[PDB]
Amino acid sequence: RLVTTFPDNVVHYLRGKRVKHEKVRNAYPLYEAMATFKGFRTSHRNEIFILSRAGYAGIQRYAFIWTGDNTPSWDDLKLQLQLVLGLSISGVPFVGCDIGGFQGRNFAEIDNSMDLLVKYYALALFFPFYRSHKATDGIDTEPVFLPDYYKEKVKEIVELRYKFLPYIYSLAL
Amino acid sequence: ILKIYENKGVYKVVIGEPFPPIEFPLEQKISSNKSLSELGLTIVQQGNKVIVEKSLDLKEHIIGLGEKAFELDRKRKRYVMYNVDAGAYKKYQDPLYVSIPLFISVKDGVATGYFFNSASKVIFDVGLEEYDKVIVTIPEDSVEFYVIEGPRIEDVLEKYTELTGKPFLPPMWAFGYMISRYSYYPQDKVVELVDIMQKEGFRVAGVFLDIHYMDSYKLFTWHPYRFPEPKKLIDELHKRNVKLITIVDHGIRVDQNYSPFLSGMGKFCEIESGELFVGKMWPGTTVYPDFFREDTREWWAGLISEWLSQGVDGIWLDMNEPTDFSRAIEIRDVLSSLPVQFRDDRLVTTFPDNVVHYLRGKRVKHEKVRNAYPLYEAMATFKGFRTSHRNEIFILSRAGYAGIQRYAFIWTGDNTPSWDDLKLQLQLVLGLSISGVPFVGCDIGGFQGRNFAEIDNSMDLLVKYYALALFFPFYRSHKATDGIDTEPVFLPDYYKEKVKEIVELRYKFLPYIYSLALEASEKGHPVIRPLFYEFQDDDDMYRIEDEYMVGKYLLYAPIVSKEESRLVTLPRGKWYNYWNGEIINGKSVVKSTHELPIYLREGSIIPLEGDELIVYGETSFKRYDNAEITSSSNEIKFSREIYVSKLTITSEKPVSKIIVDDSKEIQVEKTMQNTYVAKINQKIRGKINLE
């Protein structure tokens, strides 16, 4: 995976000084989020919403963070919980994961069963960021495409979330 | 150029000047009034390619495409139709062994079929490239496809079957319990095993002989040491009423003293430059028959016929994708030393690109007609049975193309034993079934042995396989060389008894299954069906994949997990619980009450072993022996005199007595809720009344 990072000969200008990318790499997303947040101010937009995949200390000033490209599976339920809680205990409060898992059907070790999907909705019941996201070749995971049995379960879980939204938002404040 | 022909709700669209892999007759070529736009299609011709587009709505369902390791509703995936030796395939792997370029669209409850008659590497991009479109790409400058009107899915399949060919009617023993392995030998061991199986109560219909029976893998030969007395072997099995099916590959060994090689000369596949296509297969250096040629077909039929004359009862065609290993071996020889791990590109096992065939006198590239290869091999093999005046025909094929149903059964190849595979096998056989190939099955217990860690050989999983395929048309146990022995006789009594009861239950339902087979060969209706086939108007049905219908009357929800019970989704209408007698209202979810969750639909007639008969509601049914049975008000009519042993009537209203032909009255007995039994044990002229 390290092959997907910027090469070693890349440089930036931090506070007027020329520095190597490897010395300041992790702060890159922080400064991008900062500039994007500034973009909302420039528009006199009071309701700000920014989602970021990467981050560094301070990223909480400007954005929500979701756990990226997770794989649908029973084990992933426990993994996502460790990921969001680790982020949360580290200063980044607004977090979540892709409900139903991002990965589609590009490899065998993916579990697209509907009862697992229902467990994802239930797992993130109280997560700050509650989003369903799926890859291009993954089955359609919108609740409206589920058999009535499962559709009703997702419907009741989402309604229960909205019922607790006031509490969640107070904690956000 | 663009021509459109119509007739019987089937539009034949011709783009350019097509040269089909096989020609399908049209009994009325009437030029159509409907245009492409009224057909909802867009067509583009480019660099030797034809792209056909159709819109795709959010609620629209796409089914078919044959053997696909994916969910039955095919949306959000780009499929490739190219026969390939899939090896130890896993879910979501594509492509596989069979290529049926047919897909059915169900929009607003109405079904429409689309069949592209090209055996080239056709791409079906179902809402992937463009979320709201189905894009079909045919790698040829010309092509002929058909739009098949429904409106019922069954209506599309009847027309499709009418077009490509009705399934042949196989003998009843072809649906019996088959034992197989890779491989059973020497000949004395084959008989010993059959004896133990029968002695312990297992009714074995036939045994399959894999490649170890041949002499150095040479087709049409017997291993001199393992099978020195083929006649003895054959008579012993027949003496025990057991059929013998022998595997036959497609590779002819390049051997100077091998008869088939010498007699087949002139009829083998060639390469662009004119030499023979010499490759690698089980017998080593090999050449392959060009089955696209009439004469090659006649030559093959002759060898088959001669082979059948020793008393062999069936032919099992394998590796007929067609597969070749020369490329793989070439790579393994050059990089064998290197301590690096190779990638598993299955496409490397297909024929090279420079291979050519002669189709209807014309020289064509293998890549243009590849998928039809197994079809022509099966055709020639079927012709071999005719040449032998053999009425009971049995042919098993691994690969296939549209029309393969005319000549053979298809099994899902080299599956891996695992709990997840239970669900995969169900999608595979149902996909094949909804695509025109009715006689299908999978290797019970899984083919893979112990050549890699991710294989589950637990006995309770094995039992679940037997239970899963309870109603599959093809019921065979097959295992790889290094796999544990999976024959029931080697299981602890606890598990052995369970397999025994499952097999007995299958034989009890054989009459119904065989009647559905007759229906398949006459009307092209599949034997096993996904729920959406009978209830295409209910969107929920397209997400149910661990349940399947056997015919129009029986719903089976096999247990595909370690649980003791499962949730069963019942379609609209009333359903009768086969085991405890409960009748539940459709469009609901209930918990299973038995290990084998079977439910009968209101309006069912099911013939069982030993002339037994189950009737629930009003319907009409044709038994395999031509006897038609009809149930209405309180009357069961028979098209002709037939014997009836035990009659079971399920009814919410009590039944005190039945009357045979207006005179004799038979004692009725309430055995459980909604269940009434009458021990008739006598011939019935024409009717039975209920009171």
Q: Kindly report the CATH number assigned to the domain that includes residue B325.
A: 3.20.20.80
Q: Of the residues B67, B158, B236, B318, which is catalytic?
A: B318
Residue B164's alpha-carbon distances to B10, B116, B245, B404, in angstroms, are: 12, 12, 27, 9
- Select the residue of A112, A140, A149 nearest B589 (Cβ to Cβ): A149
Structure tokens that stand for B476 in this block: 């065979």
This structure was determined by X-ray
Which has the closest alpha carbon to B75: B47, B105, B36? B105
**Are residues B392 and B447 located together in one domain of the fold?**
yes
d(CA B178, CA B488): 12
* A145 contact residues in B (CB cutoff 8 A): 539, 543
Mutate to test the interface with B, among A103, A137, A142 (most CBs of B within 10 A): A137
**Are residues B549 and B628 located together in one domain of the fold?**
no
> Could you give phi then psi for residue B172, rounded to 5 degrees?
-60, -30
Residue B74: closest C-alpha in chain A: A139
Residue B78: closest C-alpha in chain A: A137
Helix or strand (DSSP H, E) at B111: strand B110-116
Mapping DSSP to helix (H, G, I), strand (E, B) and coil, where does residue A93 land? coil
Q: Of the residues B53, B144, B321, B547, which is catalytic?
A: B321
**Are residues B239 and B361 located together in one domain of the fold?**
yes
**Are residues B120 and B212 located together in one domain of the fold?**
no
**Are residues B67 and B178 located together in one domain of the fold?**
no
Query: Which stretches of chain B sit within 8 Å of chain A by CB?
Result: 70-71, 73, 75-78, 90-93, 128, 539-540, 543-544, 567, 569, 587, 589
Indicate yes or no: CB of B70 within 8 angstroms of CB of A137: no
**Are residues B315 and B358 located together in one domain of the fold?**
yes
Query: Which stretches of chain A sit within 8 Å of chain B by CB?
Result: 104-108, 110, 112, 114, 136-140, 145-149
Q: Give catalytic residue positions of A.
A: 69
* Residue that finishes a domain, picked among B110, B136, B151: B151
| Residue B57, min C-alpha distance to chain A (Å) | 13
Residue A151: closest C-alpha in chain B: B540
CB count, 10 Å around CB of B400?
32
Indicate yes or no: CB of A138 within 8 angstroms of CB of B76: yes
Angle at B292 between CA B389 and CA B98, to 5 degrees: 90
**Are residues B244 and B291 located together in one domain of the fold?**
yes
Pairing, β B177-179 against β B206-209: parallel
Residue A74's alpha-carbon distances to A116, A119, A138, B453, B666, in angstroms, are: 7, 9, 17, 21, 57
Structure tokens that stand for B471 in this block: 């109603």
Mutate to test the interface with A, among B70, B71, B92 (most CBs of A within 10 A): B92
Residue A123 corresponds to which amino acid?
L
Could you tell me which residues are beta bridge partners of residue B556?
A: B548, B598
Residue B32's alpha-carbon distances to B9, B17, B150, B257, B665, in angstroms, are: 11, 18, 17, 58, 60
Pairing, β B110-116 against β B102-107: antiparallel
Residue B77: closest C-alpha in chain A: A137
d(CA B506, CA B175): 9
- Burial pattern B499-531, b for ≥16 Cβ within 10 A else e, equals bbebbebbbebbbbbbbbbbbbbeebbbbbbbb
Residue B380's alpha-carbon distances to A63, B292, B294, B391, B440, in angstroms, are: 68, 10, 9, 16, 20
d(CA B125, CA B96): 17
**Are residues B284 and B193 located together in one domain of the fold?**
yes
Residue B253's alpha-carbon distances to B250, B261, B276, B281, B306, in angstroms, are: 10, 7, 13, 8, 19
Indicate yes or no: CB of A140 within 8 angstroms of CB of B543: no
Q: Can you spell out the DSSP letters for B487-519? A: -GGGS-HHHHHHHHHHHHHHHHHHHHHHHHHHH
* A72 contact residues in B (CB cutoff 8 A): none
Task: Decide if A99 contacts A84 (C-beta within 8 A).
Answer: no
Resolution of the model in angstroms:
2.5
- Active-site residue B546, yes or no? no
d(CA B648, CA B142): 57
Instruction: Report CA dihedral (B492, B494, B497, B499) to the nearest 10 degrees.
Output: -80
Count of domains observed in chain B: 4
Mapping DSSP to helix (H, G, I), strand (E, B) and coil, where does residue B333 land? helix
B109 Rama sector, left if φ>0, alpha if ψ -120 to 50, beta otherwise: left
- Select the residue of A110, A148, A149 nearest B92 (Cβ to Cβ): A110
Residue B577 corresponds to which amino acid?
N
| Residue A27, min C-alpha distance to chain B (Å) | 36
Indicate yes or no: CB of B90 within 8 angstroms of CB of A104: no
- For B345, counting Cβ atoms within 10 Å of its Cβ (0-12 exposed, 13-18 middle, 19+ buried), the class is exposed
Residues, chain B, total? Answer: 691
Strands (E) across B479-627 are located at 528-529, 548-550, 554-556, 567-570, 574-577, 583-585, 588-591, 598-601, 604-608, 612-616, 619-622
Pairing, β B409-411 against β B440-444: parallel
| Residue B87, min C-alpha distance to chain A (Å) | 14
- Active-site residue B321, yes or no? yes
- Select the residue of A107, A139, A148 nearest B71 (Cβ to Cβ): A139
* A137 contact residues in B (CB cutoff 8 A): 76-78, 128
- Select the residue of A107, A140, A147 nearest B540 (Cβ to Cβ): A147
d(CA B323, CA B249): 10
Indicate yes or no: CB of A148 within 8 angstroms of CB of B540: yes
B231 Rama sector, left if φ>0, alpha if ψ -120 to 50, beta otherwise: alpha
Residue A107: closest C-alpha in chain B: B92
Could you tell me which residues are beta bridge partners of residue B577?
A: B599
- Active-site residue B540, yes or no? no
Angle at A120 between CA A114 and CA A123, to 5 degrees: 145
Structure tokens that stand for B96 in this block: 């596989």
| Residue A122, min C-alpha distance to chain B (Å) | 20
**Could you list the residue range(s) of the whole structural domain that residue B58 is in?**
1-151
Q: At what angle do helices B459-468 and B493-523 cross, to 10 degrees?
A: 20
**Are residues B246 and B217 located together in one domain of the fold?**
yes
CATH of the domain at B596: 2.60.40.1180
* A148 contact residues in B (CB cutoff 8 A): 540, 587
Indicate yes or no: CB of A149 within 8 angstroms of CB of B543: no
- Burial pattern B585-606, b for ≥16 Cβ within 10 A else e, equals ebeeebebeebbbbbbbbbbbb
Indicate yes or no: CB of A105 within 8 angstroms of CB of B543: no
Structure tokens that stand for B57 in this block: 């709505």
* Residue that finishes a domain, picked among B511, B527, B543: B527
**Are residues B106 and B161 located together in one domain of the fold?**
no
Mapping DSSP to helix (H, G, I), strand (E, B) and coil, where does residue B176 land? coil
Count chain A–chain B contacts defined by CB atoms under 8 A. Answer: 39
d(CA A136, CA B78): 10
Indicate yes or no: CB of A149 within 8 angstroms of CB of B90: no
Indicate yes or no: CB of A108 within 8 angstroms of CB of B93: yes
**Are residues B162 and B31 located together in one domain of the fold?**
no
Could you tell me which residues are beta bridge partners of residue B3?
A: B14
Which has the closest alpha carbon to B75: B36, B133, B122, B121? B133
**Are residues B133 and B254 located together in one domain of the fold?**
no
* Residue that finishes a domain, picked among B486, B506, B527: B527
d(CA B405, CA B158): 13
Residue B53's alpha-carbon distances to A99, B2, B80, B306, B435, in angstroms, are: 32, 15, 16, 49, 21
